Design a binder for this molecule. Structure first.
Ligand SMILES: O=C(O)[C@H]1CS[C@@H](c2ccncc2)N1
Ligand SMILES: [Mg+2]
Length: 712
């Protein structure tokens, strides 16, 4: 075949060559020694990996049975809790403790702000994200619906001056709210100057300084006629660009060209749910972009340099010009044929990701082409998705420890971001944090994945509420508060990120600005945004809310109970009319079809996908998990029939075809000839039997089938 023999392993040649020729050089790791370590690590840790996956199945089987032997009625929580305890699903909560994680960057320990997640397979999205640390507020305001597109202020072919003036006014108000002048409003300023190391803002009738002079960070150009002024508020920078000879400056009272906000402080380069990677060739494409980012030489457009400034008193300094990068590895479930053993068995993908993304991350720890690209404190930041409970966290930590050895890195170099997106983690969260107390740099929550696990876990209990309803259910609201509480009680404030979920509605920025503020108000030091534009707008929220103070106020509170976490989202008696049932079916079938068609046919794992009401959504694979589990749950409990599912699929497919009006090939009307349509159908009809409702086993198979057909 086309493989390389290393002990028990048969490595795909494309991968072997990539690692030898591109990833190993410059790391001073012995190539033979590295490969020996890969073989050694796979052999030692594969059996525990498999053991953990079987224990998931065993717990799920026992809960399915607990439900099936019970008839209607209200749950009875005390017995249900007792049962979860007896089977080892719910573990005892350990004594209070403080995380000890060290060598972590300021961007993570102290700075509160937006966090971007982008597919690592998309070199252009990755580059834009890396460069999104500093973003234009005027661009973000002019370009989105934050400034309403009403009469006179619509966006046209060229610059609309009514719209631009509303932009200017919006930004002036933000300045007044965030960096108050001792007297007057930024709205009336005529100029900015720096005298005696103090910012002087010229007004028509007088001059004035900042109410808090400490918020003056510095400037560029002459003190007496600066090109920009730099401010700071809640640890985030704001840059006022001054240029009377610009498109916009020429219309402005102080000649202000733009307001730049430090925006995406950190970015997660994703190998998991936003990318479709089903073989060695796909994984190498991903590893190669991760390498270019870390070497600082990726070009699809290039990576930004650091930003130079003059301190208030006259000296010089610099600020980071790039988002600090995490990588999200895949989780414990999937195997990938990038490496097989002598029996032909595929190796666990999570284990490989640990080895390869960690090897590659070494490059971001040293000089590019050219200070070093990423972590100056010596850490590698790995986000680990889809873990179930503290034994699985303990395993990932042991995995990172073994990889560190192989790579000659000091212990605990590899830091972990624990996603709280499975129920067994949620109800054992303190213990999960404790398992990683020397490695953890964040925890976070979300809607899509965790809800999928909620539905699957209690699949046998009865019919669940609609998808849109899930978002406001008692279990999920308790889930969110419980996550923050656990983090703060573990000492995360000043040490680690407490994060919340993605805003998926890419074009509804006015709505985002209005409602996403709830997240920092709830004490989240960070939350997920779908674009650099959204990062800039979400940065506004961190100027309005003092997250550090919020966290200090939540200190010691217990605002959710285990009971609340365990409140299954069962629908009540006769909750829906026939038309509401059909709408929900249509909604879920369209979300599956819309996503699956681009995934299976084009290997795209994220994009702006129009929903059934043609609202653009940027969701990852988790949208599949929830929609398919909901449909499967409704089929399981007689809410809908299989002919109902079929009819909806048949209706939604031509609608999706139209929404994709390119290399797109229509699903209709010959459905059984479309691999992606058959994939959509399978996810639903096999939903109940997929381990924890995971969609990867089916998706990866179908995509590999499509690729094989495409090679004939
Ligand atoms: O991990 C999760 O649960 C998901 C929920 S939305 C998703 C995502 C959406 C868009 N781009 C990247 C990632 N992250
Ligand atoms: Mg997820």
């Amino acid at each position: 075949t086309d493989r390389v023999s290393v002990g028990n392993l048969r490595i795909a040649r494309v991968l072997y060559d990539f690692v030898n020729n591109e990833a190993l050089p410059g790391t001073d790791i012995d190539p033979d020694s590295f490969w020996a370590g890969v073989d050694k690590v796979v052999a030692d840790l594969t059996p525990q990996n498999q053991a953990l996956l079987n224990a998931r199945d065993e717990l799920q089987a026992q809960i399915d049975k607990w439900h099936r032997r019970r008839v209607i009625e209200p749950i009875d929580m005390d017995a249900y809790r007792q049962f979860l305890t007896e089977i080892g699903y719910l573990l005892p909560e350990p004594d209070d403790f403080t995380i000890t994680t060290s060598g972590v960057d300021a961007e993570i320990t102290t700075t509160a702000g937006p966090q971007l997640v982008v597919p690592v397979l998309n070199a252009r999205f990755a580059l834009n994200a890396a460069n999104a640390r500093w973003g234009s507020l005027y661009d973000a305001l002019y370009g989105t619906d934050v400034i309403p597109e009403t009469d006179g202020a619509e966006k046209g072919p060229t610059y609309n001056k009514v719209r631009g003036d509303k932009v200017i006014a919006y930004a002036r108000k933000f300045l007044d709210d965030s960096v108050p002048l001792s007297s007057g409003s930024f709205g009336d300023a005529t100029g900015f100057t720096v005298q005696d190391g103090q910012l002087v803002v010229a007004l028509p009738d007088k001059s004035t300084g900042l109410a808090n002079p400490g918020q003056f960070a510095g400037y560029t150009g002459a003190a007496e006629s600066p090109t920009s002024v730099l401010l700071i508020n809640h640890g985030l920078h704001i840059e006022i660009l001054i240029d009377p000879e610009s498109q916009v400056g020429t219309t402005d009272r102080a000649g202000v060209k733009d307001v730049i906000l430090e925006s995406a402080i950190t970015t997660i380069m994703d190998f998991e749910d936003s990318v479709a990677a089903v073989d060695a060739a796909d994984k190498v494409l991903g590893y190669r972009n991760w390498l270019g980012l870390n070497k600082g030489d990726l070009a699809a457009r290039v990576l930004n340099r650091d930003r130079n400034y003059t301190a208030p008193g006259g000296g010089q300094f610099t600020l980071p010009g790039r988002s600090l990068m995490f990588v999200r590895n895949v989780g414990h479930l999937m195997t990938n044929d990038a490496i097989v053993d002598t029996d032909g068995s595929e190796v666990f993908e999570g284990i490989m990701d640990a080895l390869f993304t960690g090897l590659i991350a070494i490059h971001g720890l040293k000089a590019s082409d050219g200070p070093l690209i990423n972590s100056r404190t010596g850490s590698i930041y790995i986000v680990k998705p889809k873990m179930h409970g503290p034994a699985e966290v303990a395993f990932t930590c042991e995995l990172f420890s073994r990889v560190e050895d192989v790579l000659g890195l000091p212990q605990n170099t590899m830091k972990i971001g624990i996603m709280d997106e499975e129920r067994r983690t949620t109800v054992n969260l303190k213990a999960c944090i404790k398992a990683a107390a020397d490695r953890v740099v964040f925890i976070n929550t979300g809607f899509l994945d965790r809800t999928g696990d909620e539905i699957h876990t209690s699949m046998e209990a009865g019919p669940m509420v609609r998808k849109g309803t899930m978002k406001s259910q008692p279990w999920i609201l308790a889930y969110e508060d419980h996550n923050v509480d656990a983090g703060l009680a573990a000492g995360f404030s000043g040490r680690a990120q407490v994060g919340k979920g993605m805003w998926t509605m890419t074009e509804l920025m006015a709505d985002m600005v209005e409602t996403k503020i709830a997240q920092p108000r709830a004490g989240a030091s960070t939350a997920w945004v779908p674009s650099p534009t959204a990062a800039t707008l979400h940065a506004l929220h961190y100027h309005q809310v003092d997250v550090a103070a919020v966290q200090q106020g939540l200190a010691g509170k217990r605002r959710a109970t285990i009971e609340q976490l365990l409140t299954i989202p069962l629908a009540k008696e006769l909750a829906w009319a026939p038309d509401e049932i059909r709408e929900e079916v249509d909604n879920n079938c369209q979300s599956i079809l819309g996503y699956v068609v681009r995934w299976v046919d084009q290997g795209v794992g994220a994009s702006k996908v129009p929903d059934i009401h043609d609202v653009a959504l940027m969701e990852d694979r988790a949208t599949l998990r929830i929609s398919s589990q909901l449909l499967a749950n409704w089929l399981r409990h007689g809410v809908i029939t299989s002919a109902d599912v079929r009819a909806s699929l048949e209706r939604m497919a031509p609608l999706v075809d139209r929404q994709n009006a390119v290399a797109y090939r229509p699903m209709a009307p010959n459905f059984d000839d479309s691999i992606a349509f058959l994939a959509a159908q399978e996810l639903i009809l096999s939903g109940a039997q997929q381990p924890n409702g995971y969609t990867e086993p089916i998706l990866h198979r179908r995509r590999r089938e499509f690729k094989a057909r495409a090679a004939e």
